[PDB]
Design a protein around this ligand. Structure first.
Ligand SMILES: Nc1ccn([C@H]2C[C@H](O)[C@@H](COP(=O)(O)NP(=O)(O)OP(=O)(O)O)O2)c(=O)n1
Ligand SMILES: [Mg+2]
Ligand SMILES: [Mg+2]
Ligand code: NA
Ligand code: NA
Length: 326
DNA sequence: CCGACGCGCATCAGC
DNA sequence: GCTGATGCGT
DNA sequence: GTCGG
């Protein structure tokens, strides 16, 4: 973190554009700039030096010059003193409350944690759980706990069907010493791109993890994606562990490599890679990589037999998960 | 300049 | 009920 | 907000 002050500033600006301005491309613009600067191996001396990096333009270079000269940004200082922006930015920190709902709540005079807690009936299910564990979801998960959780999930899954394979992805697979949550990729030979020979494949796993009281809440749940809450068990007289967010994604067995590429991330790495794929005349999702016709219509799925194959198609040198943290 | 910026589940409007 | 748009999230 | 065409 040679440029922590700068990347913090850009992230706060990114969050402003997302939550208050509702300008998603500015949000992405700032986050991209923050990302490229984060991995720049020099302590930045000026905006001109930063402007040389892909993603940093004139407006951000000027902000970096202001920040380096004064240690702050007047634009951010103003935003911080604005009541509406500060209220909206706070509310969106609750999972399930986005920019639209946040602004709506503020209009109705619901703008503090305390307001939320007396108006539970005005929240949808996702939001109510987001409020419930607002404090816990703020906390990061030490990798040591991630390993305990991996152990539980992987063996409970084995107990349901020995042919399930569960892979912990996200920041954990990228080797992070702490994670924001747990991300699990799930496969079963009964579910392929060709057919689904068995119903309830995801359900039965969720069910089992609920039975052993690992999963405690459900934010959303469909045939292929589960979004919920989990908690490690604690020993006698021990204070309980924080409740954690857990995502489970069932992916067709034969499309594992596209799936694990997707779910390993990071989110910005995926955006950059998929954008690059477009420039190279391909499109990538969690299932396949497809060529683009001159028309701009996707073709048939190309053969993929490793994560590296996907990198090869778009003429990228392979990058291990630990080097995908952008 | 200026177009473009990488899919699952919950909810709602419209029919 | 189904279809498509929107919100929110991964 | 930034970039390639
Ligand atoms: N916008 C997004 C958000 C997530 N994802 C994918 C890539 C992520 O690594 C994976 C899990 O999302 P995540 O849990 O929000 N982030 P990730 O695990 O990388 O870091 P943490 O904050 O969880 O430690 O989903 C994506 O492709 N685009
Ligand atoms: Mg994660
Ligand atoms: Mg997650
Ligand atoms: Na630049
Ligand atoms: Na939120």
């Amino acid at each position: 973190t040679l440029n922590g002050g700068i990347t913090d500033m850009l992230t706060e600006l990114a969050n402003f554009e997302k939550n208050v301005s509702q300008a998603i491309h500015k949000y992405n613009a700032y986050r991209k700039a923050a990302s490229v600067i984060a991995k720049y191996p020099h302590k930045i001396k000026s905006g001109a030096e930063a402007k040389k990096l892909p993603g940093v333009g004139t407006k951000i270079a000027e902000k970096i010059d202001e920040f380096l000269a004064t240690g702050k940004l007047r634009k951010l200082e103003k935003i911080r003193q604005d009541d509406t922006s500060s209220s909206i930015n706070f509310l969106t920190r609750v999972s399930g409350i986005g920019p639209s709902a946040a602004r709506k709540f503020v209009d109705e005079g619901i703008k503090t944690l305390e307001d939320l807690r007396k108006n539970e009936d005005k929240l949808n299910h996702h939001q109510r759980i987001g409020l419930k564990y607002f404090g816990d979801f703020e906390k990061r998960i030490p990798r040591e706990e991630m390993l305990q959780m991996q152990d539980i999930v992987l063996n409970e899954v084995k107990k349901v069907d020995s042919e399930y394979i569960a892979t912990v992805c996200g920041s954990f697979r990228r080797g992070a010493e702490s994670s924001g949550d747990m991300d699990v990729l799930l496969t079963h030979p009964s579910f392929t791109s060709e057919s689904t020979k068995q119903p309830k494949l995801l359900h039965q796993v969720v069910e089992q993890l609920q039975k052993v009281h690992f999963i405690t809440d459900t934010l959303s749940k469909g045939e292929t994606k589960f979004m919920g809450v989990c908690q490690l068990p604690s020993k006698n007289d021990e204070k309980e562990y924080p409740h954690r967010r857990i995502d489970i994604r069932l992916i067709p067995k034969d499309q594992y490599y596209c799936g694990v590429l997707y779910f390993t991330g990071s989110d910005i790495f995926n955006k950059n890679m998929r954008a690059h794929a477009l420039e190279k005349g391909f499109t990538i999702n969690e299932y396949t990589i497809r060529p683009l016709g001159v028309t701009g219509v996707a073709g048939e799925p190309l053969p993929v037999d490793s994560e590296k194959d996907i990198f090869d198609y778009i003429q990228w040198k392979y990058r291990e998960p630990k080097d995908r943290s952008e």
